[PDB]
Amino acid sequence: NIKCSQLTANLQNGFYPVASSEVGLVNKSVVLLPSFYSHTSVNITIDLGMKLSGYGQPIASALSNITLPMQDNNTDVYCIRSNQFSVYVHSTCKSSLWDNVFNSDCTDVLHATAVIKTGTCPFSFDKLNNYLTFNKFCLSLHPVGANCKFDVAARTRTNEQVVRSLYVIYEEGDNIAGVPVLHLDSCTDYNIYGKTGIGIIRQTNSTLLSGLYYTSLSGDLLGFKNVTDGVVYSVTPCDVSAQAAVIDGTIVGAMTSINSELLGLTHWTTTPNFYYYSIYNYTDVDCEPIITYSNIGVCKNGALVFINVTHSDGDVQPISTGNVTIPTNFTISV
Amino acid sequence: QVEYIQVYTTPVSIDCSRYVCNGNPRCNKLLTQYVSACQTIEQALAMGARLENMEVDSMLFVSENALKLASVEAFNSTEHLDPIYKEWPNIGGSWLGGLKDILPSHNSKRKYRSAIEDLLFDKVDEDYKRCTGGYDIADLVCAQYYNGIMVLPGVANDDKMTMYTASLAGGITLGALGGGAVAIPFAVAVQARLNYVALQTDVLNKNQQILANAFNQAIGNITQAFGKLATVAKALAKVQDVVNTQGQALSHLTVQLQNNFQAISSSISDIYNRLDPPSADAQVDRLITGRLTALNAFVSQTLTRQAEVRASRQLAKDKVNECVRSQSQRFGFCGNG
Amino acid sequence: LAKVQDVVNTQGQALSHLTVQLQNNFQAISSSISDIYNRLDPPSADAQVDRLITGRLTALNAFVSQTLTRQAEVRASRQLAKDKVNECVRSQSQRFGFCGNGTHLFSLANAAPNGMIFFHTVLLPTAYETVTAWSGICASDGDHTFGLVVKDVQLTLFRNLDDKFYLTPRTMYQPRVATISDFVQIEGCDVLFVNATVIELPG
Amino acid sequence: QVEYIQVYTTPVSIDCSRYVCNGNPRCNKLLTQYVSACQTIEQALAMGARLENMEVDSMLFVSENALKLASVEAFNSTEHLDPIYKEWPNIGGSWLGGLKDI
Amino acid sequence: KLNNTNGLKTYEFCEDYEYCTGYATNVFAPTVGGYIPDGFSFNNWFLLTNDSTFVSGRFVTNQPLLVNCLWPVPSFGVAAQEFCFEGAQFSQCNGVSLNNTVDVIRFNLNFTADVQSGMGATVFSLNTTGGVILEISCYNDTVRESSFYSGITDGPKYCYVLYNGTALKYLGTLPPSVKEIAISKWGHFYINGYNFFSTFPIDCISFNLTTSTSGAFWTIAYTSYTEALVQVENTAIKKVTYCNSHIN
């Protein structure tokens, strides 16, 4: 892994940046503000019409139809009037013979599926059911007043062609949520009040009286509050940076901040700044440092030494009183 | 007279992959397509720090015998004084009233630290084991660490420099080099310095008391100024500027992670939670480009500052060698007078 | 070796970065002016080429700034090199610690990529000679008492087995016989002076 | 031989809000969200100019008696000469030909 | 200070509340112009936010900190009023009032179980634009949507927005550490400084509140927006400096 990160198969001795661990499968935690439960399903029906061109290729008709659920005696504008919603697409295929009359089912060559592509919208249609929150979300077949639009396309074994457009009118907020607990002390994928990420959530006994959630200077979530009992939870990344020491193409040690095993190393010691894991059988030591870093050095047996300042006898002083020393026996230094 | 000279910079380690991608596995594969972009930044930053460490290490040194004599207790005792110096009460003598503010004392928190050093380090975070427990909300330094920004100690350290300066101070009174720590009074060394300036032909009416009193009063007024005389003001301003610049540089790099770079959001997890991968990749590429440009600018500014501190350290080395470890024959080099 | 390698690598990298910026289209359809004029009519092509012009001018400005900064730094380094040549190679310096760590004997120079390498030959001691030193001589001519100090403050006065006075430098142990022209006569004496009569005085 | 060395720069003061907003009352209200941004710029410039002024002022000095003798007219006269130099016509002497341009 | 023990009642006079109790009071008299004095404690006072909360720092902000009037509610007293956001020059004001229009109204009260409403389950009654009447009501049991509920209780309290006597919106349970409620005439509600919900713009609002037998005294502040430098430590206000003069 270090070789792949460093883009070379022959590593020179030294220190290389690694992660304290790797993140695999995780659970999802979602936290929202209290509300009533009222869920709606929005089913969109797309009827595609296909013909065969004079060149023998499938052509998707512009006479394909989109049908939204019935609302206020209409099926051209459907909007949300509940607290939660989900969206589904149901597709159908028909065939024609250049007469624009669709009476037969779609053949194997002409079979197509209806796909809704992002278009100009700042979200995907398939991602609406991923806990996105709006103050207003409302779909139309007419372009007036629309903030953005999706693209309706027919996908065939050899092609994909846009046939229609679906327009969206939305207002940001948290009143409506699109839908398909809290996990503590383990790495989890969290969506807390619209803040999304991966990390570890822990319960602290701190007492912050103001606000709901807290962020860092870069915008990362650092903690949040439970709206029922006012308990503050802290959020930390579930991996940190570490330094691996490589001598003669092998891992001999690793400096880290988490007191947990990494990189296959078992033994460890504590230094005023970090934890040093190593192959050396820990419970100082005398060895020659092979590699150096900051104020410390690492030997060939994976042991840690601290580099001291240079020592000298001292400077001769301009004093003529008592017993004094004058240098006598001289060699040459270059 | 007081003079401040900067010797080293504060080394900063940047984890480029964690700065650009906030640990997101999908952003890492996208950043891989930028060939050797993080590697170049990391290598430049590491090479600069290694060169500075090598240059600094060939300048600091200590001697054990001089370290045994460099304390207020040693200067106030008559233990190490050579037998001929029986009339003298202690090493420091009438000069001690000043030397007590400059010499290290055991009435201090850290080893080899003096009162003036305490005042300077109070008037004008290194442990990252506290940023992982999650017992409270993280502070600024822990958050910067979460963003891939670490501040490390180098070979040049407040401990090694204190040992260096204490050994330099204690080496003035070391009478011989072959064996144990033999000591001479401070007044004897001052008399030798006076003889170097001009051969003293009045051996009877010596008036070193006037010089000692003036030195004590000057050191006392300097110590007052450091805790609450234009040289002291200039030194304080220079130290404050040096400290402020590095903090501003670090904070400006963290404020660039809140920039959209013409994308829908500034959060990679927010982009990958709202868009299909074909479009989320095109939105994340802009953040990757902008966040790499920011790191390149940071590296350039750091290398320029290291280049200037090189010359500053050369001047400091000359001052130590020619004003502290010897008496200079250059006019006006070690102060006005 | 590290310094020379860093110098070479940085020089190369600056030019490489300058060259790599010609593949950047600054919000334009292409980074090739010929292709732009081949694909678009002049009124649109000019508006497309303006972006390339602006971006390339900005790149040139950045290159010029970094070049001037590097030149100032090398100017300081060249001043240091000239001082080293004049005071370590073309003469012997009286400055402590300037031409290496130790007592400077001589220096040689060789050419290196973009500069010079200095070989400083210095003296390294391996032993110390211990002598009992004196600050002066309190001389008594029966009733008249005066003092003798040393003209040169760089010399140390001591006594051999036969109680003859010798002078030595403190840089190296090279004892010599002390004569009367090496002393200055003064009125007072000191408690740390050595007591001697006119018989034992230097000749 | 002639040598030139630079001793100081030409200091510049910037009013951050007047540069960004051309005295517009409405633009200043938007810049309040960047009040830290302008304060960082102004402090960096003022501190750099204060430190150069401190170092230049501790380098220059004059002597009142030396400035009296520092003129072409004073070197061409014998008014300030010690009376033991009565055999000399003036201070400048034969070196006055080149000292008159300095 | 009153002390009753076994039928014997004693009382002491207190000039400084902090001296007799150890912590500062929230009753203050605004200076000329409507500014909070320079040594105030800011105990039930928060920074209003629609986003994350600042923990520690210094910020120049436009906040409702210009006090048109401060109303100290005496111990064992009732504060009842139907206030339309247009002038707050009342005789209950502590100090000198201002004739400016009011933007925000803040109740600086520990909303514990000892707080009781004289309107029943209704805590606030809002008359919105067009004469639409909304109501904030907290009950001892949950209410189904578009339905209705079917002196003090103990346990959780569930709070609702009612439009025509039927539950329109569910807000949540009342937390145990509510210290201030700020209401803006544009319909925004801030609880401990955070905007939890909003309604239509409010033409006029009615309330009728009391702290019962606690003997606790609290304040209502009528406030307007102003520019100020605020220092915050642990999400709490430490110092407020108004930009009301040249040196300021």
Ligand SMILES: *[C@@H]1O[C@H](CO)[C@@H](O[C@@H]2O[C@H](CO)[C@@H](O[C@@H]3O[C@H](CO[C@H]4O[C@H](CO)[C@@H](O)[C@H](O)[C@@H]4O)[C@@H](O)[C@H](O[C@H]4O[C@H](CO)[C@@H](O)[C@H](O)[C@@H]4O)[C@@H]3O)[C@H](O)[C@H]2NC(C)=O)[C@H](O)[C@H]1NC(C)=O
């Ligand atoms: C500038 O240049 C000067 C030279 O002029 C350098 O000073 C010399 O530095 C060396 C290295 O520190 C000094 O030598 C060391 O002395 C130690 C003490 O000696 C004791 O033991 C020996 C027997 O071993 C006795 O003869 C002696 O009387 C003492 O009792 C030695 O222990 C050191 O040995 C080294 O090698 C062994 C073998 O591996 C190691 O185990 C030791 O740890 C050690 O590394 C060594 O000999 C020397 O005395 C200094 N000389 C002078 C004249 O000062 C400066 O260091 C240099 N400065 C800079 C900044 O580079």
Ligand SMILES: *[C@@H]1O[C@H](CO)[C@@H](O[C@@H]2O[C@H](CO)[C@@H](O[C@@H]3O[C@H](CO[C@H]4O[C@H](CO)[C@@H](O)[C@H](O)[C@@H]4O)[C@@H](O)[C@H](O[C@H]4O[C@H](CO)[C@@H](O)[C@H](O)[C@@H]4O)[C@@H]3O)[C@H](O)[C@H]2NC(C)=O)[C@H](O)[C@H]1NC(C)=O
């Ligand atoms: C509204 O809600 C708040 C909660 O935020 C309540 O506030 C606390 O209430 C208690 C009870 O009155 C106050 O307690 C007093 O604390 C003093 C010590 O305090 C300061 O320093 C400590 C540090 O240790 C802080 O933690 C603390 O907050 C204070 O700032 C004690 O000295 C007081 O009691 C002592 O003195 C009295 C009189 O001399 C004696 O009779 C006692 O025996 C004792 O020696 C007292 O315990 C506390 O200060 C309040 N905290 C605050 C304001 O932050 C409000 O009381 C509550 N109000 C209503 C209307 O219910």
Ligand SMILES: *[C@@H]1O[C@H](CO)[C@@H](O[C@@H]2O[C@H](CO)[C@@H](O[C@@H]3O[C@H](CO[C@H]4O[C@H](CO)[C@@H](O)[C@H](O)[C@@H]4O)[C@@H](O)[C@H](O[C@H]4O[C@H](CO)[C@@H](O)[C@H](O)[C@@H]4O)[C@@H]3O)[C@H](O)[C@H]2NC(C)=O)[C@H](O)[C@H]1NC(C)=O
């Ligand atoms: C949390 O989030 C909410 C929602 O975004 C924010 O709400 C806004 O709050 C501001 C107050 O800070 C409201 O601003 C006011 O709007 C009034 C109505 O606007 C109409 O009329 C004005 C002209 O009078 C037109 O310019 C405008 O286009 C509208 O047609 C204005 O009348 C107010 O200005 C008046 O009062 C101010 C003093 O308060 C005077 O200085 C003015 O001269 C004038 O007399 C003012 O502009 C805004 O309407 C709210 N938006 C809404 C309700 O959607 C919160 O501010 C935010 N909270 C925090 C703490 O961040």
Ligand SMILES: *[C@@H]1O[C@H](CO)[C@@H](O[C@@H]2O[C@H](CO)[C@@H](O[C@@H]3O[C@H](CO)[C@@H](O)[C@H](O)[C@@H]3O)[C@H](O)[C@H]2NC(C)=O)[C@H](O)[C@H]1NC(C)=O
């Ligand atoms: C800062 O420097 C000033 C001098 O510029 C110091 O003031 C001086 O203090 C000494 C006392 O230590 C005064 O001494 C004379 O001393 C003898 C001592 O026996 C005393 O008998 C005389 O009455 C007289 O005080 C000295 O005159 C005084 N100088 C001035 C100008 O007032 C001051 O103490 C220094 N502050 C420190 C050291 O922190």
Ligand SMILES: *[C@@H]1O[C@H](CO)[C@@H](O[C@@H]2O[C@H](CO)[C@@H](O)[C@H](O)[C@H]2NC(C)=O)[C@H](O)[C@H]1NC(C)=O
């Ligand atoms: C899409 O809908 C249109 C309109 O309803 C359909 O076209 C109609 O087809 C019927 C026969 O089923 C004809 O009688 C009408 O005259 C047609 N209308 C028009 C305007 O041409 C069309 O078949 C649908 N397309 C599909 C199902 O692919």
Ligand SMILES: *[C@@H]1O[C@H](CO)[C@@H](O[C@@H]2O[C@H](CO)[C@@H](O)[C@H](O)[C@H]2NC(C)=O)[C@H](O)[C@H]1NC(C)=O
């Ligand atoms: C906020 O606190 C409440 C109350 O402590 C938590 O609700 C409890 O959740 C646990 C675990 O699901 C249940 O066993 C309890 O019965 C619940 N208690 C009540 C009173 O409802 C709630 O889970 C906390 N919020 C989060 C997001 O964890």
Ligand SMILES: *[C@@H]1O[C@H](CO)[C@@H](O[C@@H]2O[C@H](CO)[C@@H](O)[C@H](O)[C@H]2NC(C)=O)[C@H](O)[C@H]1NC(C)=O
């Ligand atoms: C300097 O060292 C000499 C030895 O080189 C010391 O002389 C010796 O002193 C000891 C201790 O008193 C005696 O036992 C020896 O007999 C002395 N030796 C000789 C040859 O006389 C001398 O005392 C030292 N001088 C000082 C000032 O410390």
Ligand SMILES: *[C@@H]1O[C@H](CO)[C@@H](O[C@@H]2O[C@H](CO)[C@@H](O)[C@H](O)[C@H]2NC(C)=O)[C@H](O)[C@H]1NC(C)=O
């Ligand atoms: C400097 O080195 C010389 C040569 O090694 C030393 O002289 C020797 O001293 C020992 C001990 O007294 C004698 O046994 C040898 O015979 C000497 N050698 C010669 C060639 O004369 C000398 O001692 C050293 N100087 C010191 C240690 O101060």
Ligand SMILES: *[C@@H]1O[C@H](CO)[C@@H](O[C@@H]2O[C@H](CO)[C@@H](O)[C@H](O)[C@H]2NC(C)=O)[C@H](O)[C@H]1NC(C)=O
């Ligand atoms: C500043 O000092 C200079 C001298 O260093 C003063 O110059 C003197 O000015 C007076 C009045 O113009 C002349 O008569 C003298 O001849 C000048 N002196 C010399 C030595 O040339 C100057 O006046 C001072 N300025 C102030 C404001 O006091």
Ligand SMILES: *[C@@H]1O[C@H](CO)[C@@H](O[C@@H]2O[C@H](CO)[C@@H](O)[C@H](O)[C@H]2NC(C)=O)[C@H](O)[C@H]1NC(C)=O
């Ligand atoms: C120095 O003073 C002498 C004597 O006054 C100046 O020489 C005179 O120059 C004027 C023209 O400026 C002639 O008319 C006189 O004949 C000269 N007098 C002589 C030669 O005795 C001379 O110019 C002055 N030099 C300077 C100012 O550099």
Ligand SMILES: *[C@@H]1O[C@H](CO)[C@@H](O[C@@H]2O[C@H](CO)[C@@H](O)[C@H](O)[C@H]2NC(C)=O)[C@H](O)[C@H]1NC(C)=O
């Ligand atoms: C209220 O008054 C009672 C008495 O009425 C006080 O209780 C007394 O406290 C003192 C110490 O101060 C004890 O020695 C007495 O024994 C107590 N008396 C009784 C009757 O129990 C009580 O401290 C007062 N409360 C205050 C001042 O807060």
Ligand SMILES: *[C@@H]1O[C@H](CO)[C@@H](O[C@@H]2O[C@H](CO)[C@@H](O)[C@H](O)[C@H]2NC(C)=O)[C@H](O)[C@H]1NC(C)=O
């Ligand atoms: C606030 O609520 C209180 C408590 O309900 C009201 O007090 C009532 O006043 C009416 C007359 O207006 C009396 O008949 C009731 O007996 C009172 N109830 C009590 C004292 O418990 C009070 O009127 C309300 N204040 C207003 C509307 O301003």
Ligand SMILES: *[C@@H]1O[C@H](CO)[C@@H](O[C@@H]2O[C@H](CO)[C@@H](O)[C@H](O)[C@H]2NC(C)=O)[C@H](O)[C@H]1NC(C)=O
């Ligand atoms: C809510 O406010 C509206 C504001 O219009 C009140 O309606 C007014 O009531 C007054 C009462 O004197 C009438 O004279 C006005 O004609 C009404 N205006 C309109 C536009 O209808 C309304 O009464 C208030 N509602 C409550 C319950 O107090």
Ligand SMILES: CCCCCC/C=C\CCCCCCCC(=O)O
């Ligand atoms: C009683 C009037 C309406 C109250 C509505 C209450 C509903 C939601 C607000 C939750 C506020 C949480 C604030 C933090 C509480 C704490 O610190 O314990």
Ligand SMILES: CCCCCC/C=C\CCCCCCCC(=O)O
């Ligand atoms: C008409 C405008 C005249 C401007 C005169 C400027 C006056 C004083 C100098 C201001 C700048 C001082 C340099 C920085 C140091 C500091 O701000 O303290």
Ligand SMILES: *[C@@H]1O[C@H](CO)[C@@H](O)[C@H](O)[C@H]1NC(C)=O
């Ligand atoms: C998710 O939570 C379950 C319990 O609900 C737990 O057993 C499981 O290990 C968790 N999964 C992961 C991938 O951490």
